[PDB]
């Protein structure tokens, strides 16, 4: 009875003075906007209906029309930024925040959903949702002794909308807002539903992507151990955001990185660095490169966990992006590691996998590899075994590579190559 209407019919019903006719027309609009194939969002917008839907959102006496217009506006705001802007310009933000207090959970859920869609457009609409005062009523919906008493979908949508209020940068979410939200995020990170856990890890990942003060807000809440626990989950949808959050925390201070080491993260990296997913391997090797860029006690923690062989394996076979992050890890290890540690590197078999990558077209990776070779040679001088290193590099096909790199279009490549080809070869 409300299926396959026309925008003309929907408009004729919404512009009647019959609340039941308007309810029928708004339901027909919801069903139109609920279709997977080309929902006529732009036709509905041009018809001038968003204002009437927003006005229906305030009809507490007809909760059904509230719910239907909430659903309709949710799906309009789910689209392009211009469409979400139509929704916002109609005055829907304050109305949805008012609906967050509805006695009907199917209506407050839709208000949560619509505000999540609005805040997900970008930082400006996120901050406008926060200025209209959404965080207090949103977190109030989660103020329960046990979260398991709520409904799966309700909690999932609340967690999602909360993660979208932590999302986007330039600017990053307001600090007072992050402080208000984090406590509830920790609870949700300790929930049992994998969807809630995945969106909570995504939220933490957003909050940790920035200056070390943000990383510190998060780390000071004691979440690293739980993120490392979820890093070993069997559901990749949870492992990906968790690995991203841990890798972001490793971009800050050495003390913050130590928090990750102390939590046990390194014991999971044998599997992450052999993971069938290319992006898991890339993220894990990048995080390793930022750990090898830290203190020598942390490089020693890497060594102790048997992860140097896994980095050798990644430089031997992986996506070129993962191989490049591995090369960066090696260069950082050799730049700030002890001599003994560099000798361990060479004893694990780094030379040949590193030299077979001096045939790549990317210039940066060549620079990184050559800097690492230089570091290893310098470490060999302190031991007086640069001839052994030279024989090694020459017996895997390396000297040919460096010699040819002299004749490389780049300049830094040529000069580095030549200094190596002279001081040692």
């Amino acid at each position: 009875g409300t299926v396959n209407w026309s925008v003309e019919d929907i408009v004729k019903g919404i512009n009647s003075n019959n609340l039941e006719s308007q309810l029928q027309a708004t339901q027909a609009a919801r069903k139109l906007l609920s279709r997977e194939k080309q929902p006529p969002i732009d036709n509905i917008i041009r018809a001038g209906l968003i204002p009437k839907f927003v006005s229906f959102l305030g009809k507490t006496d007809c909760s059904p029309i509230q719910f239907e217009s909430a659903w309709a506006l949710t799906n309009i705001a789910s689209g392009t930024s211009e469409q979400t802007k139509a929704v916002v310009d109609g005055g829907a933000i304050p109305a949805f925040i008012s609906l967050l207090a509805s006695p009907h959970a199917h209506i407050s859920e839709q208000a949560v959903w619509a505000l999540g869609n609005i805040a997900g457009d970008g930082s400006a609409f996120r901050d406008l949702v926060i200025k209209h005062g959404a965080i207090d009523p949103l977190l109030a919906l989660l103020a329960v002794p046990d979260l398991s008493t709520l409904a799966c979908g309700y909690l999932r949508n609340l967690t999602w909308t909360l993660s979208n209020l932590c999302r986007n940068k330039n600017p990053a979410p307001p600090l007072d807002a992050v402080e208000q939200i984090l406590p509830t995020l920790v609870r949700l990170l300790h929930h049992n539903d994998p969807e809630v856990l995945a969106d909570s890890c995504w939220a933490i990942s957003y909050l940790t992507d920035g200056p070390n003060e943000r990383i510190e807000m998060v780390v000071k809440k004691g979440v690293v151990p739980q993120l490392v626990k979820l890093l070993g989950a069997t559901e990749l949808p949870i492992v990906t955001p968790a690995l991203r959050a841990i890798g972001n925390i490793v971009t800050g201070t050495d003390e913050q990185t130590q928090k990750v080491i102390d939590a046990g993260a390194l014991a999971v990296f044998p599997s992450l660095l052999t993971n069938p997913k290319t992006n898991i391997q890339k993220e894990a090797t990048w995080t390793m490169s930022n750990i090898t860029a830290g203190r020598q006690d942390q490089i020693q923690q890497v060594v102790n966990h048997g992860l140097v062989p896994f980095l050798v394996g990644v430089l031997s076979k992986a996506d070129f992006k993962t191989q490049k992050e591995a090369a960066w890890a090696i260069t950082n290890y050799t730049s700030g590691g002890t001599v003994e540690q560099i000798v361990y590197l060479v004893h694990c078999g780094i030379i040949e996998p590193l030299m077979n990558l001096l045939s790549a077209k990317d210039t940066k990776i060549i620079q990184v590899i050559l800097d690492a070779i230089s570091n290893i040679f310098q470490a060999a001088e302190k031991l007086g075994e640069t001839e052994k290193l030279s024989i090694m590099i020459e017996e895997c096909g390396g000297l040919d590579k460096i010699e040819a790199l002299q004749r490389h279009e780049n300049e830094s490549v040529y000069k580095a190559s030549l200094n190596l080809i002279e001081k040692y070869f």
């Binding site: 906007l33 799906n75 789910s78 839709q110 959903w113 999540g116 869609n117 997900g120 979208n164």
Partner: peptide, 8 residues
Amino acid sequence: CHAKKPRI
């Protein structure tokens, strides 16, 4: 995490 998601 999808930036925006519709219902049905």
